C-alpha cells in the first residue's frame, strides 16, 4: 500500500467485491465522545462522528433539549441552584 | 505475597545490591499504601503523578510529597498557620 496508508491513523478493512476481487478499504477513525466541562464525565444526546457526519444531521439531533447542554445533569442542576440562590 | 525480604524489589531479581533494593522496597511499600483523604476522611488516596495525589472516592486531588502525601515541612507549616 501507499506510504500514506501505511500510517495507523487509517483503519483498513478487507472486502470482497461483487466481481470477486478482494480490495482494501481505508477509513478515518471516529472522534471520541463529548465530556462534561466541569467533572469530565461523558455527555448524553451528543452523537459521535467526524465533521461530515455531524453536518449531515439537523440541529436538534446533536444535543439535548435542556439548558446548558455542555454539562451533565448533576452539574446543570447544581449550577442553576447556585445561580438562583445567589440572585 | 510470601517473600521474606525483597518485597516490591523482587522484580530486580539478583541485581542492584542489597542497600539499593532495600531502599526501593521500603519507599515503594510506604508510597503504595492507602492514605487518608483530607476532604472526605477515608483511606482511598492514591498517587497519580510525582507529587500529585487523588482520592478514589470523592475525587479530590491535591499536591503533596514525591512519595508521601504529606512531608514534615508541610506538617510544620500547617500547624504553624
Amino acid at each position: 500500500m501507499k506510504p500514506m496508508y501505511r500510517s495507523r491513523s487509517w483503519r483498513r478493512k478487507y472486502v470482497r467485491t461483487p466481481g470477486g476481487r478482494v480490495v482494501i478499504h481505508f477509513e478515518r477513525k471516529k472522534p471520541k465522545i463529548a465530556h462534561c466541562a466541569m467533572c469530565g464525565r461523558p455527555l448524553n444526546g451528543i452523537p459521535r462522528g467526524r465533521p461530515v457526519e455531524m453536518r449531515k444531521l439537523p440541529k436538534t439531533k446533536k444535543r439535548p433539549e435542556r439548558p446548558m447542554p455542555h454539562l451533565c445533569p448533576r452539574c446543570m442542576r447544581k449550577v442553576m441552584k447556585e445561580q438562583i440562590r445567589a440572585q | 505475597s510470601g517473600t521474606k525480604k525483597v518485597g516490591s524489589a523482587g522484580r530486580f531479581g539478583a541485581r542492584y545490591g542489597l542497600k539499593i533494593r532495600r531502599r526501593v522496597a521500603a519507599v515503594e511499600a510506604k508510597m503504595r499504601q492507602k492514605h487518608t483523604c483530607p476532604v472526605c476522611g477515608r483511606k482511598a488516596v492514591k498517587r497519580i503523578s510525582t507529587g500529585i495525589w487523588q482520592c478514589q472516592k470523592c475525587g479530590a486531588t491535591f499536591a503533596g510529597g514525591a512519595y508521601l502525601p504529606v512531608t514534615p515541612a508541610g506538617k510544620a507549616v500547617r500547624r504553624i498557620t
Binding site: - | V27, G64, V70, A76
Partner: protein, 238 residues
C-alpha cells in the same frame, strides 16, 4: 588542543540547548500593579506535572479574568480559592508582601526585587524561613543556610513547595537516569577528563592520573577551570 564540554555548551548548539517547548511555561507572578494596594481572589483549576520543573504546577483563574500558572505548594487542593495582595489572609497558597508575613513563617518563590516575578525557593520540597522584619528590610533564611535581606515590598507565597523527598528513592537503572536527563536535555552520560587524550583535557594522558593539583585558580582563563575551582579546602572534614 580541542574544546571542553563547558566550552562547547556556550555556543548554544542543539546538543546543549534546553527543549523549552515540552514545558508548560514560566511561573511568574501577575504584574505588581494588580497585586499592590489591591487583593485578588483566584480559583485553582488544575494541578499537573511539569516535565522540567522538579515541582508540580497549578493553573489559577483570578476574578479579573487573568489566568496564570504557579508552583503548587504542598497540600494545595484543586477547586480551592487563594488570595494575592497585601490583605490576603495568612494561609498556604497566599501571596503577599514580606512586610505582612509574620516571623517564623515558611515561604517560597520570593521576589528578588519588587515585581521581578520570583527567583528564590522554587525547587521541589524547598522553603525559606522569615527571621526578622524591619521598616527597610526583611531577613529570610534560604534553603542553602544563608540569611538574605529582601525589600519589604517583595512578594512571597506561604507554604512549602510540593514534591519533597524526591531523592529518597534510588535511580536504580542507567535507563532511569537516561530518561531523567533526556527529559531536560542534560549532557548524559558524562566522560572523565582523566581518561581523555592530552589534547582534550588538562588531566588527559596515557596514564589515568592528574599530572597537576586539581585545585585551579579563580584567575585561570577559560578552557582551564576544571576540577575544584577556587576551592577553600578539599577532602573530608574529619
Amino acid at each position: 588542543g580541542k574544546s571542553l564540554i563547558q566550552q562547547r555548551r556556550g555556543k548554544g548548539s542543539p546538543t546543549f540547548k534546553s527543549p523549552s517547548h515540552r514545558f508548560r511555561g514560566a511561573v511568574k507572578y501577575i504584574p505588581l500593579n494588580y497585586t499592590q494596594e489591591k487583593t485578588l481572589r483566584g480559583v485553582v483549576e488544575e494541578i499537573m506535572h511539569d516535565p522540567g520543573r522538579t515541582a508540580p504546577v497549578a493553573r489559577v483563574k483570578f476574578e479579573n479574568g487573568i489566568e496564570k500558572l504557579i508552583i503548587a505548594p504542598e497540600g494545595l487542593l484543586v477547586g480551592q480559592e487563594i488570595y494575592i495582595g497585601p490583605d490576603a489572609p495568612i494561609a498556604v497558597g497566599n501571596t503577599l508582601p514580606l512586610a505582612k508575613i509574620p516571623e517564623g513563617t515558611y515561604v517560597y518563590n520570593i521576589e528578588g526585587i519588587p515585581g521581578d516575578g520570583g527567583k528564590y525557593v522554587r525547587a521541589g520540597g524547598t522553603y525559606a524561613l522569615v527571621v526578622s522584619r524591619e521598616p527597610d528590610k526583611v531577613i529570610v533564611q534560604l534553603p542553602s543556610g544563608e540569611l538574605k535581606a529582601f525589600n519589604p515590598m517583595c512578594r512571597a507565597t506561604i507554604g512549602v513547595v510540593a514534591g519533597g523527598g524526591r531523592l529518597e528513592k534510588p535511580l536504580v537503572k542507567a535507563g532511569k537516569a537516561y530518561y531523567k536527563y533526556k527529559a531536560r536535555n542534560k549532557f548524559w552520560p558524562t566522560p572523565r577528563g582523566v581518561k581523555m587524550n592530552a589534547v582534550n583535557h588538562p588531566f588527559g594522558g596515557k596514564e589515568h592520573h592528574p599530572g597537576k593539583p586539581t585545585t585551579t585558580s579563580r584567575r585561570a582563563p577559560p578552557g582551564r577551570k576544571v576540577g575544584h575551582i577556587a576551592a577553600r579546602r578539599t577532602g573530608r572534614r574529619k
